[PDB]
Design a protein around this ligand. Structure first.
Ligand SMILES: O=C1CCCN1CC[C@H](C[C@H](C[C@@H](CCN1CCCC1=O)N1CCCC1=O)N1CCCC1=O)N1C=CCC1=O
Ligand SMILES: O=C1CCCN1CC[C@H](C[C@H](C[C@@H](CCN1CCCC1=O)N1CCCC1=O)N1CCCC1=O)N1C=CCC1=O
Ligand SMILES: O=C1CCCN1CC[C@H](C[C@H](C[C@@H](CCN1CCCC1=O)N1CCCC1=O)N1CCCC1=O)N1C=CCC1=O
Ligand SMILES: O=C1CCCN1CC[C@H](C[C@H](C[C@@H](CCN1CCCC1=O)N1CCCC1=O)N1CCCC1=O)N1C=CCC1=O
Ligand SMILES: [Mn+2]
Ligand SMILES: [Mn+2]
Ligand SMILES: [Mn+2]
Ligand SMILES: [Mn+2]
Lengths: 179, 179, 179, 179
């Protein structure tokens, strides 16, 4: 019965909390035990949804938040209709306007560090990467940040707020030092 | 009690399913017996609605999905107020921005083939044709595709997803080979 | 218990029907007895609302549809803050973008005829007039039609549909010849 | 049991009334006793919300209307991510598009007078000020009025309407002469 678990449930929206619970159980993880991961999973969902909401009405397909199987089905349809290359790991969105997949990251360290780790991992000459930290930095492939400034600013604002809420509950250091 | 019938009811939205049922009974067809047609009818409704949703707020009148009589009443009002020519077969939308009717098609073969068949049929020097296939092709009158790229991409994505769902249930070949 | 009364209640939206009933009782008229006026009042409400919906989000103040007293209060605030001249008769909208009041008319005759009658009546060097007929014509002050083409086309479409519905019930001639 | 209290509850939206009640109790004030302040607090909330609604979708963060603590948390996140200077008094919005805080004022006197008082108070070389009166004037830092004309016009309209409602109840002079 952790403080972090109760904190997450009052910080994030109930739909986000339930998608995060569903995602963690799919990969065999327990949200009551791995409560830092529970927070991170919610955070990442939220960001990905605020991101898709920047931009014009039909711009993004949302991959993140779906069941694994359906997410891959949607990736294949997209691959099979734009001719874009099939990613090896599930990305988070597809950008119909620039014809590319996007991998959104959210990190409690240097973006430099998390970007390289993502780059190396997916090795998809194609897929765009976009990282945000909890201290306001972002880093994106070819310095091309996809959305305009006001929509990314909102996300960075929301991340700093989450950090403050954690810190004022004394949960921030345990969260920071378990990434 | 076919697998296809239950598949359609979980693939499409309930409002689409009910309009499709209404349309088939109007033409004396039974959705429980002619289950490929039931799928096609849902598909065509869906596409036509995703199509009207591309574009700016007042752009399209939606003809498809209405009762026959009301659909013709709306066609006549449009004819009677823009001076456009009265079509012989009901189209699916009217484009207020380009002042033309549009016939949307969705095909399980070559678009070349289905386009000619539509052309020949309506013989309306006026009415624009726009076909989509389930393998991502589209074809439109004067190569003028009406909407921008992202809205048509979404439709082609959704069609490929429907195809995958059918195939993973072993319904795809029976659907493909009954068009 | 007229056919026209039941026709109006199934043709127009319930909120429009209730505002029309409220407006007629304010001027001492009975919607069950004066059923042509009941139709016209609904029609005029509808049009004025479809009109305000053309244009960008804050463009119009809606005067029509309010209680008399509140409508005048809103006119005075507008006069008292833009310095525009106080109209003698209640108009239907205010255009914040062009800084003028608008009088919307809907006629079962020549627009030429109804426009002059409106002009003469309000004598407001200032207030813009915009008439629509049920046969698709419109006429506006300085040939300046305020909205773009697609939003006015929709209105003219809806008016022709109302006319057809009346005619197929044999109510059209009585409505036409009582304006 | 004042007339002003009942007037406010029928003039303003219930959500605004409840936020105003919450704000006044936070600063130890009683909405039943200080009924002019209750009106002013509602007015100021309303304006600030109509203001945030002018502009494009992600443009403003809304600070006003939150609990004190959360409002400061949001200010800090914004400061901590845009590098803008921390204000000493809580502002009402943040403008992501121009990267500044905004202090909205609403006054029953000369805007000249209320602007100086605000200027002097916050002494934030940075924060933009935007005053509206109940007689239609506005005044803003560097004559830069943030929103376009139609959105500010709406606000000034609404303020004059509130003034008229008060005056026709004989509450206006007591409200005017207690600011
Ligand atoms: O907080 C808000 C503000 C506006 C509405 N809303 C509710 C939640 C949506 C996300 C959900 C996303 C979720 C919802 C679950 N499902 C399953 C059936 C279809 C659907 O939408 N989806 C969309 C497809 C993939 C996926 O995982 N969104 C974003 C698009 C509209 C919506 O509900 N959202 C959008 C901005 C932030 C946010 O949380
Ligand atoms: O899935 C969604 C996302 C946004 C809302 N929604 C519900 C269904 C609407 C279509 C219906 C169409 C249908 C609805 C039935 N009726 C009868 C009375 C009026 C009305 O709308 N219409 C519109 C006129 C002709 C016709 O057959 N649409 C499209 C426009 C808004 C709406 O409900 N829709 C729009 C995009 C895909 C889709 O399915
Ligand atoms: O059919 C639709 C499609 C979109 C929503 N909707 C419901 C009715 C609204 C009009 C009402 C107007 C009415 C509603 C009654 N009231 C009294 C309290 C505030 C309010 O709105 N108003 C607006 C101020 C003056 C007036 O008479 N509209 C238009 C603006 C949003 C709305 O509800 N509407 C807008 C397009 C056609 C139409 O009928
Ligand atoms: O009258 C209308 C027309 C459109 C919707 N709506 C309801 C009230 C909203 C304000 C509320 C603001 C309030 C609502 C309370 N909360 C607490 C949880 C999140 C939230 O929204 N917020 C937003 C964040 C800070 C704050 O105090 N707004 C403005 C944005 C959408 C909304 O509900 N609003 C927007 C234009 C005038 C107005 O009164
Ligand atoms: Mn990611
Ligand atoms: Mn068709
Ligand atoms: Mn009128
Ligand atoms: Mn203020």
């Amino acid at each position: 019965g952790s403080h972090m678990e109760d904190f997450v449930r009052q910080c994030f929206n109930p739909m986000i909390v339930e998608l995060a619970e569903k995602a963690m159980k799919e990969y065999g993880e327990d949200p009551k035990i791995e409560t830092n991961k529970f927070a991170a999973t919610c955070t990442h969902l939220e960001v990905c949804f605020m991101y898709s909401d920047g931009g014009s009405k039909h711009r993004f397909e949302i991959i993140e938040g779906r069941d694994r199987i359906m997410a891959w089905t949607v990736v294949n349809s997209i691959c099979n209709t734009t001719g874009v290359e099939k990613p090896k790991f599930l990305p988070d969105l597809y950008d119909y306007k620039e014809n590319r997949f996007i991998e959104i990251g959210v990190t409690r360290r240097e973006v430099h560090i998390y970007y390289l780790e993502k780059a190396n991992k997916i090795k998809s000459e194609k897929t765009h990467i976009h990282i945000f930290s909890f201290t306001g930095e972002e880093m994106a492939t070819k310095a091309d940040y996809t959305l305009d400034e006001e929509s990314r600013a909102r996300i960075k604002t929301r991340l700093f707020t989450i950090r403050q809420e954690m810190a004022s509950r004394s949960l921030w250091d345990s969260f920071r030092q378990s990434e």
